[PDB]
Design an enzyme around this catalytic site. Sequence first.
Site, PDB file in Angstrom:
ATOM      1  N   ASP A  35       0.649  -1.269   0.039  1.00 44.30           N
ATOM      2  CA  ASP A  35       0.002  -0.013   0.016  1.00 44.30           C
ATOM      3  C   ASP A  35       0.952   1.295   0.047  1.00 44.30           C
ATOM      4  O   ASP A  35       1.069   1.761   1.013  1.00 44.30           O
ATOM      5  CB  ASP A  35      -0.933  -0.001   1.189  1.00 44.30           C
ATOM      6  CG  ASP A  35      -1.740   1.202   1.355  1.00 44.30           C
ATOM      7  OD1 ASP A  35      -1.938   1.749   0.461  1.00 44.30           O
ATOM      8  OD2 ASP A  35      -2.599   1.254   2.352  1.00 44.30           O
ATOM      9  N   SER A 199      -0.859  15.932 -11.428  1.00 44.32           N
ATOM     10  CA  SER A 199      -1.085  15.864 -13.080  1.00 44.32           C
ATOM     11  C   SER A 199      -1.378  17.061 -13.509  1.00 44.32           C
ATOM     12  O   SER A 199      -1.829  18.272 -13.130  1.00 44.32           O
ATOM     13  CB  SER A 199      -2.334  14.853 -12.998  1.00 44.32           C
ATOM     14  OG  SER A 199      -2.574  14.424 -14.448  1.00 44.32           O
TER      15      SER A 199
END
EC number: 3.4.23.22
Length: 330
Positions: A35, A199
């Site tokens: 994770d 992004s």
Amino acid sequence: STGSATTTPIDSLDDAYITPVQIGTPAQTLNLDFDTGSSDLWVFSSETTASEVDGQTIYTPSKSTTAKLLSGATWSISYGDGSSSSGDVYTDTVSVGGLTVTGQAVESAKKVSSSFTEDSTIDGLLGLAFSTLNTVSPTQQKTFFDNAKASLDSPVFTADLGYHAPGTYNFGFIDTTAYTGSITYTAVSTKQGFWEWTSTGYAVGSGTFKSTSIDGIADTGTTLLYLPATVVSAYWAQVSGAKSSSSVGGYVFPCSATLPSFTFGVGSARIVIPGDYIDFGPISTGSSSCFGGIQSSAGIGINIFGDVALKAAFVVFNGATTPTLGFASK
Ligand SMILES: NCCN1CCOCC1
């Protein structure tokens, strides 16, 4: 040194991926959910409340000649999905794909929430976010990557998740045969303890790319791609019959649909998620509706580039002094 281990979907929909991890001496192999959105290595164990174990393989520290109880240390974690677990802490020898860390903190569960109990395929989690999110108290512990970091040939690990297929987690090296084109890197903020980055925009199917900044985290422990409502609504508007369902908990669409791809920007580079990856799966076997692989982040408080996005790329988690994140097409 380096390590290389295969990660495998727990079911037909890629709900999560499990990677075998060797703990203790002799080795005890547990299938952990790696994770990058958390920082505790915790396992189902000989201490876990019997009624909360349902098919998981347990770690038994009394059978390990290298296990050492870390006296006075406990852990307790709550995840974004409402699940939780807590227990005691040992150190033991932990190996992942041939890479060995001695003295790694292994958090032995005494209690786990119902969500963990019902997933018989997941024996615990191996956290790969920054060690500042580790919950061991009072003595905060380092992640497996942080402990390995000095001994690795290069301080990096890569995630190469497969779509309905196995993938690979590599530590200390870059496999140049695993991606097409090149690996584009982007800045990371460690302020919240995550592999947090921005992004550069998106495109829906064959549409024109929209340049827009989207802060988010690269999270292998989250199944889907969670983005702002604006982006998500523009994506699902291209799918006839797509709608947000309150009973199912997000966007559903008729299973009959072939979906458009979704592109996200990494600097001037572009990562294309194929439509089939976004067709997550039917809300049940035989159902009319299918659950979207792209969902709104509106209730969460952070955008999450989960497995739906990460499985479309070769991802490099660069753990140098100033961390960076790399993405390559595949
Ligand atoms: N037990 C509910 C959560 N889990 C998470 C991982 O995949 C299967 C479902």
